[PDB]
Design a protein around this ligand. Structure first.
Ligand SMILES: O=C1CC(Cl)=C(Cl)C[C@H]1O
Ligand SMILES: O=C1CC(Cl)=C(Cl)C[C@H]1O
Ligand SMILES: [Ca+2]
Ligand SMILES: [Ca+2]
Ligand SMILES: [Ca+2]
Ligand SMILES: [Ca+2]
Ligand SMILES: [Ca+2]
Ligand SMILES: [Ca+2]
Ligand SMILES: [Fe+3]
Ligand SMILES: [Fe+3]
Lengths: 308, 310
């Protein structure tokens, strides 16, 4: 049967969204009416059964009980889609030359201590991860180095786990998480260990949905960044570790070809405080976009974990 | 505002995310996911929904599930009623619209209540503020003949608006105000209970947070829930509302039906029936069940339901 176009259904949608209500949050009512209307039409069009609907309702309970709604947002492409719309806006405005954005993901932790120029961020021993230096120069789109810019990174350990989100046991606070203010020449450096990519929690709601679609829930090895500086927009980006077999099969659709730097083998590690003489080095330079009339039209406010 | 939805990049992303071009799998599930995601992406594009707005919605979904309230929200934004509208329309088209009208189940059924023959007393806990109530009727098929041994199940709230197994102020006795009766040889059932009071959504929970955002209340009028089943017939999900409740036509779950507001009668003689006062109220609520078409019930609903041991 098809009922969506009937007066009874359209009146129910108007009442459920309180479109005819006293002055209120008009924007919220507009969004709720649109999403509810679309859901009702999809149920009608695809003949979605009550059993199927209640299975979707039950899934929403599990999704939130697991705390995984933002992980699902990445896994079904919604987080990438937000980047697509931001990129389209920048393109229409004539912007080029900045380091490409990519997704934040759900695992930022606020409050990491800020160091000048260089930070050692591996606080916990990890025998299976080799030492890694990440270094680079931050500039603006005019090519000039940005001094005092804030470069933040976070990444996983050799088991694919992040501090504050490790199910096998608590890591030291801010393990593999750090913030550096660039030096006078725009330079930043992190001394860390090499990340390994991971999968979604195997019994969690995100992987349950992915299993139902026939999809894996894995990401290639990567390092996250936030980069900010006076006169410039905040950049959310990442880089992928070259050579990872999942680099073009990320379940969160986040890989970009300009964000895959070369990995160089180096010696002299002990004088840098690394745990072995031989280590890997990645040079990741970063270009920030200036503000427009003092405004950052793309910084994102969302719930984020914190720690002391 | 940009418009990207109808670009190859976005359509390719939707196909990958729902795995449309994947190896053999659950095509139906992939079809539903692709449709829901596509509509969501189009709505974000059409209404210029900002990342901050999207992450607030994602955060709400986390709170909804953490509260265990997705089924309460399904009732509150009309989705549960909408499923009834579609079932009613299918019944009308098939000629299976001759029985007592359906209405929503709601999320508070509990399996395992004790069953009695003919008559059941289901108020196990005292409730000084609720007066005694007899609910009785006859179960027939659409041809009018009584159905013997049909199962009539009842559940409802106490005077504070709380159900057993879902009372936040303290545990009720298992299956307080929950019972089942097997009809007698002439189709009769009777419940002896206490009068329910209507209630509201948990005030701090996700459902009321969203309703507050819309400017709506989260209250229901007083009512009694029923399942009725019997061999050879479809399972009926229905309710009745208590006459005179001011919320009767302003139910936050849109479940009231004019056919399901029975006359309440004042009676005396309660003590002889095991009621706590001489005066009591009686509601007659007859049930007409539809015979199975082709031996199968194609409107019965399987959903997660609580259960308990008596
Ligand atoms: O750190 C990460 C963990 C998860 Cl689940 C996503 Cl979705 C992104 C990735 O960067
Ligand atoms: O028992 C009830 C409680 C809630 Cl929340 C709904 Cl939605 C329906 C009503 O029958
Ligand atoms: Ca340029
Ligand atoms: Ca240490
Ligand atoms: Ca450990
Ligand atoms: Ca549409
Ligand atoms: Ca008693
Ligand atoms: Ca007794
Ligand atoms: Fe990550
Ligand atoms: Fe109820």
């Amino acid at each position: 049967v098809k009922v969506f176009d009937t007066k009874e259904v359209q009146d129910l949608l108007k009442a459920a969204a309180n479109l005819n209500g006293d002055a209120g949050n008009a924007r919220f009512r507009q969004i709720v009416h649109r999403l509810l209307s679309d859901l009702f039409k999809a149920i009608d069009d695809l003949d979605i059964t009550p059993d199927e609907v209640w299975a979707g309702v039950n899934y929403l309970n599990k999704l939130g009980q697991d705390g995984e709604a933002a992980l699902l947002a990445a896994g079904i492409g919604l987080e990438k889609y937000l980047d697509i719309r931001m990129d389209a806006a920048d393109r229409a405005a004539g912007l080029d030359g900045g380091t490409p954005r990519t997704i934040e993901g759900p695992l930022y932790v606020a409050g990491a201590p800020v160091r000048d120029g260089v930070a050692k961020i591996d606080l916990d021993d990890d025998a299976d991860a080799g030492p890694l230096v990440i270094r680079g120069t931050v500039t603006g789109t005019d090519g000039k180095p940005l001094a005092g810019a804030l470069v933040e990174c976070w990444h996983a350990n050799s088991k694919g786990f992040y501090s504050h989100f490790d199910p096998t046991g608590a890591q030291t606070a801010f393990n593999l998480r750090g913030a550096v203010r660039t030096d006078a020449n725009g330079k930043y450096e992190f001394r860390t260990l090499m990340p390994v990519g991971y999968g979604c929690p195997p019994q969690g709601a995100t992987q349950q949905l992915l299993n139902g679609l026939g999809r894996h829930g894995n990401r290639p090895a990567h390092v996250h960044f936030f980069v900010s500086g006076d006169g410039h927009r905040k950049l959310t980006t990442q880089f992928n570790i070259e050579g990872d077999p999942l680099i073009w099969d990320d379940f969160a659709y986040a890989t970009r070809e300009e964000l895959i730097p070369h990995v160089v083998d180096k010696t002299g590690g002990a004088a840098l405080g690394m745990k072995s003489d031989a280590y890997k080095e990645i040079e990741f330079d970063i270009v920030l976009t200036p503000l427009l009339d003092g405004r950052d039209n793309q910084v994102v406010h969302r719930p984020r974990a914190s720690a002391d």
